Amino acid sequence: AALRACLILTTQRWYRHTFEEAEKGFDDRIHGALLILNELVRISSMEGERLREEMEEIMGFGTKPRHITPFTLVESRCCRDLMEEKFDQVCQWVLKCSLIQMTILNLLPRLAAFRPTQYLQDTMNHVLSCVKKEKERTAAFQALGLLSVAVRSEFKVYLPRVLDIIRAALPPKVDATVFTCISMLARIQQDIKELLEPMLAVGLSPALTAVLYDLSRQIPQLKKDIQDGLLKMLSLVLMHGSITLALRTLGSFEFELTQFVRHCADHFLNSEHKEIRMEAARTCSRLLTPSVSQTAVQVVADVLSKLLVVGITDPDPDIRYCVLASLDERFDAHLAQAENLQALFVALNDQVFEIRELAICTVGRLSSMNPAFVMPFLRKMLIQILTELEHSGIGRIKEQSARMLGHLVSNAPRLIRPYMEPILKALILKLKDPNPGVINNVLATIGELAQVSGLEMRKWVDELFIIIMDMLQDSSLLAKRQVALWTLGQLVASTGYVVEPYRKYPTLLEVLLNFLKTEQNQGTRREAIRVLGLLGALDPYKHKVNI
Amino acid sequence: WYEKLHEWEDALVAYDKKMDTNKDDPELMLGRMRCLEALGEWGQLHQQCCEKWTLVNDETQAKMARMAAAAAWGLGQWDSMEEYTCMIPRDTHDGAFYRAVLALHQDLFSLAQQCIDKARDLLDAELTAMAGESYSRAYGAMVSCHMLSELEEVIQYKLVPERREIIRQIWWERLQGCQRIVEDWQKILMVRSLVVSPHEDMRTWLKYASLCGKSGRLALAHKTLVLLLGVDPSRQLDHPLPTVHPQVTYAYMKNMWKSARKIDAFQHMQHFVQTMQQQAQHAIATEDQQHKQELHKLMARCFLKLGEWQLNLQ
Amino acid sequence: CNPKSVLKRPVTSEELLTPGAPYARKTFTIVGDAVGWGFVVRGSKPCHIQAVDPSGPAAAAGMKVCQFVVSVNGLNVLHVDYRTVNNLILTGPRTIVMEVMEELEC
Numbered sequence A: 001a002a003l004r005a006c007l008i009l010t011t012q013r014w015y016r017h018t019f020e021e022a023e024k025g026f027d028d029r030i031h032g033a034l035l036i037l038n039e040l041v042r043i044s045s046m047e048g049e050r051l052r053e054e055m056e057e058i059m060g061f062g063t064k065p066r067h068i069t070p071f072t073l074v075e076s077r078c079c080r081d082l083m084e085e086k087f088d089q090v091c092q093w094v095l096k097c098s099l100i101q102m103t104i105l106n107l108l109p110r111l112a113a114f115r116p117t118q119y120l121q122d123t124m125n126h127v128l129s130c131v132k133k134e135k136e137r138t139a140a141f142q143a144l145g146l147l148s149v150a151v152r153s154e155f156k157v158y159l160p161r162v163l164d165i166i167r168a169a170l171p172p173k174v175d176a177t178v179f180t181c182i183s184m185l186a187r188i189q190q191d192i193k194e195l196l197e198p199m200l201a202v203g204l205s206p207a208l209t210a211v212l213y214d215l216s217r218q219i220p221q222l223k224k225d226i227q228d229g230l231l232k233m234l235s236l237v238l239m240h241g242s243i244t245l246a247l248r249t250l251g252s253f254e255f256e257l258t259q260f261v262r263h264c265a266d267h268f269l270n271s272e273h274k275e276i277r278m279e280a281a282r283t284c285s286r287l288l289t290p291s292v293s294q295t296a297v298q299v300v301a302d303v304l305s306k307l308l309v310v311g312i313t314d315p316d317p318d319i320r321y322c323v324l325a326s327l328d329e330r331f332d333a334h335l336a337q338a339e340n341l342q343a344l345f346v347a348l349n350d351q352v353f354e355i356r357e358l359a360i361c362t363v364g365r366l367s368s369m370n371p372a373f374v375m376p377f378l379r380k381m382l383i384q385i386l387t388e389l390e391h392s393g394i395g396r397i398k399e400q401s402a403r404m405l406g407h408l409v410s411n412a413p414r415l416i417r418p419y420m421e422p423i424l425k426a427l428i429l430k431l432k433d434p435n436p437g438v439i440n441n442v443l444a445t446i447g448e449l450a451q452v453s454g455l456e457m458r459k460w461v462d463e464l465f466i467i468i469m470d471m472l473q474d475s476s477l478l479a480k481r482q483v484a485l486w487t488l489g490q491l492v493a494s495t496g497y498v499v500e501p502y503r504k505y506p507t508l509l510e511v512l513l514n515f516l517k518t519e520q521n522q523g524t525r526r527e528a529i530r531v532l533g534l535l536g537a538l539d540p541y542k543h544k545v546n547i
Numbered sequence B: 001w002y003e004k005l006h007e008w009e010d011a012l013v014a015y016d017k018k019m020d021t022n023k024d025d026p027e028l029m030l031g032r033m034r035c036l037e038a039l040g041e042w043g044q045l046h047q048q049c050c051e052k053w054t055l056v057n058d059e060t061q062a063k064m065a066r067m068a069a070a071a072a073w074g075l076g077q078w079d080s081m082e083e084y085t086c087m088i089p090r091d092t093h094d095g096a097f098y099r100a101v102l103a104l105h106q107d108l109f110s111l112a113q114q115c116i117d118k119a120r121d122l123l124d125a126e127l128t129a130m131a132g133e134s135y136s137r138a139y140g141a142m143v144s145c146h147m148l149s150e151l152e153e154v155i156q157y158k159l160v161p162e163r164r165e166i167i168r169q170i171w172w173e174r175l176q177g178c179q180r181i182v183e184d185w186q187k188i189l190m191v192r193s194l195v196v197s198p199h200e201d202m203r204t205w206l207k208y209a210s211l212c213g214k215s216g217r218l219a220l221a222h223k224t225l226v227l228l229l230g231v232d233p234s235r236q237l238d239h240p241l242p243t244v245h246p247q248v249t250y251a252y253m254k255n256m257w258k259s260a261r262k263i264d265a266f267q268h269m270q271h272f273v274q275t276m277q278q279q280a281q282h283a284i285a286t287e288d289q290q291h292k293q294e295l296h297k298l299m300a301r302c303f304l305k306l307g308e309w310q311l312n313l314q
Numbered sequence C: 001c002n003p004k005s006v007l008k009r010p011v012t013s014e015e016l017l018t019p020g021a022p023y024a025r026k027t028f029t030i031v032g033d034a035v036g037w038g039f040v041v042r043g044s045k046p047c048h049i050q051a052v053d054p055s056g057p058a059a060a061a062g063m064k065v066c067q068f069v070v071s072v073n074g075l076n077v078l079h080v081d082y083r084t085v086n087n088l089i090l091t092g093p094r095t096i097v098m099e100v101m102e103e104l105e106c
Ligand SMILES: O=P(O)(O)O[C@H]1[C@H](OP(=O)(O)O)[C@@H](OP(=O)(O)O)[C@H](OP(=O)(O)O)[C@@H](OP(=O)(O)O)[C@H]1OP(=O)(O)O
Pocket: B207, B210, B251, B254, B301
């Protein structure tokens, strides 16, 4: 493993030495010899590594952006000889050598892809012997699938041994490796038609669902048959930890379901387990896809009611957090009910900030749609946000209030456009207080306030450049300058200050160029370039005049 | 040698001698494309690149792809610019800029944003190395990132119609600080064409037309004036010049005086000042705040030219 | 002057429909990139591929120039204009499921 890491770095950025050292042991020293060869084979040929990664593991270009964006060779020559030597060792050391057997399976997957049929038949036969052997069934399971990846003709008829082995073993019952072999060998269309029945009795594991999901998307031979078994098993699962996995399967991808949603409001109201309630909120929201006929309009407003009650009175915020997170901007068509508002109104005055932060953003679009009661209530809350800034001399409290302000303006820009005076004046005085946490939030809020008030924030830019420039130029503290740089270019793309600041401040051009070499973060560098473009491309002579 | 001096008019004739007399390797033809692009003659460049696009090496057309795309963009033929765009290398600054402006035309706002961000990191490497020597050396790349920020404002222009009165005000004041170079203004003004037509803002194009004539080629400055009028006054001389757009026709009469016509311009100037006096009067509506003062200011310039030109002629 | 054209075959719509021909059908799924897929289709009736970016994702997963398409993301587009196919692929998801005629060197 250490040699492979060193070899990988060299390959990304000694081939003769590696080949010569391996040949010394080829002419106790069984697992080590294959391990070195396997690392060299993997580095030389990484095509088979994708299959191993997949086995271990198992929206749109035309969308309008949001109006208010918040802050973010030698080895190849010695290939046939190595393959011939490897075949002899496997055939000879078939049962008399488990350290060698463990390394043999790893070497076989690399050799099959690199060297593609006497060798293929012998490798499958050796894997077949190790299929029923101890400590080799799991390793040999992917060995058969690797052969089918290299050539479909090699496993045209010999792949059926894997299906035959799992034909009676799966129904009888180590089930994780059984599903992996089928998925690896899947990539003809009639074998999986009836072989899925043994996999049903194998067990309820994430690997089985992940493998089945991949097969349907990659190879939809019989989508209806695949959806028949998947839907039938899920329905009977809830008829009586195992149940939690079944709920995730339905919420993973789309299916072809009004009987589940009516009963979907029972587990979190009766089961005392905290883990199951976490997924209960998520599966309800994603299962309401069909949302003009008075057959589903009434029921959809009913299933939404249960989540709202749970999301405010649950003992732990973790269950409440996922309730509101699931109810995204998509559900704006069903959150306008007056009775449903009371659940959201209480969420503003909640114990934890994680729920309040999302609640104020959620009601921001709700306030623009239902301002009958939200608008009078938010007037008192806004004053308390500013009240804690000055009346209480605590740096932790001020940071909390400022962050909530950004969510409100970034979601309801129209209401805040003429009300810049109570906010901008307070924030400016905050920046000149005679705690780095508060600074990173007021600057982000100001940048968001500069987008809504186009050409209106004109009398404050003169006094706002000084505050920002001191945070960048002659910065005694190496704090986060990304926020200051981002808002500096955000209040000049709307106000219109482009060429004039280059004269009043004959240092802005120099300091921005210095950030290219000193700073190393990719996001920060792409923002300094944008500020340069927004300011302009003044000729070099005027730069000399400005000194 | 002429290309290294940024002198293209005598560079093109040099390649003509080496090509028209005898065809040679595909290196002289590629040299002309670098000269036609700099001059700004998209009509001649488009026919050469399209005809030669087939019988060239695959590696050879990689260099030609960037120049051929600009000619299609200048002519407004977006149907063929797509084919030329997909052959520019995707790991270069120019390879992402030309496929970013292509997304704007077909209304792909999400795809265009990634390309703009992708082009900034590619230009980052080229800008930091040049900035380490002096600011003057690092100016050819700064004008490139200036155009990158203009594409973002194009996205905002197409989305919110309420801001299409200050977007075409930053573009004016930001261009004033830029160096007065015909090549620099040609690229920047071409970016400001996917949304705003030349007839939508003659104030910027009139300043560009004057720059071309004063320090560069008079031929380029002449075709940019007939475009604004919509008709070519050079075709018919007996007919009077167009009366509408007094500012545009005022600059046209100065162009005739500069190049060859010191007598026809004087005759047309007399008829222009005569008609403006009648246009100034007989106006029941009162616009003394802006229109009347602006009209009177133009009259002083027109009368001043009459005195100077008549003394020169007589 | 404006069009260029690449494929030697003038028309192949009727031959494509006929079962007897050297071509073997293949389905290619192309994943989107940070700057685009990098392929152009400019065939009136058959909607043949016009050009492919050699460094683009399409060229990595086959997608040679001399190919014809009949279905995109499931929908059958065997007989439509090239412009209509361009609208469909852009309005679809980032990942595009495509079928390539892939003539066998004939
Ligand atoms: O070079 P000229 O033929 O003498 O014309 C100049 C020139 O105008 P153009 O841009 O149309 O060439 C000046 O502009 P620049 O030198 O800055 O480019 C302009 O001055 P302003 O930009 O300040 O308006 C000035 O106008 P004016 O006479 O009002 O001083 C105007 O002179 P004429 O109108 O007399 O030709």
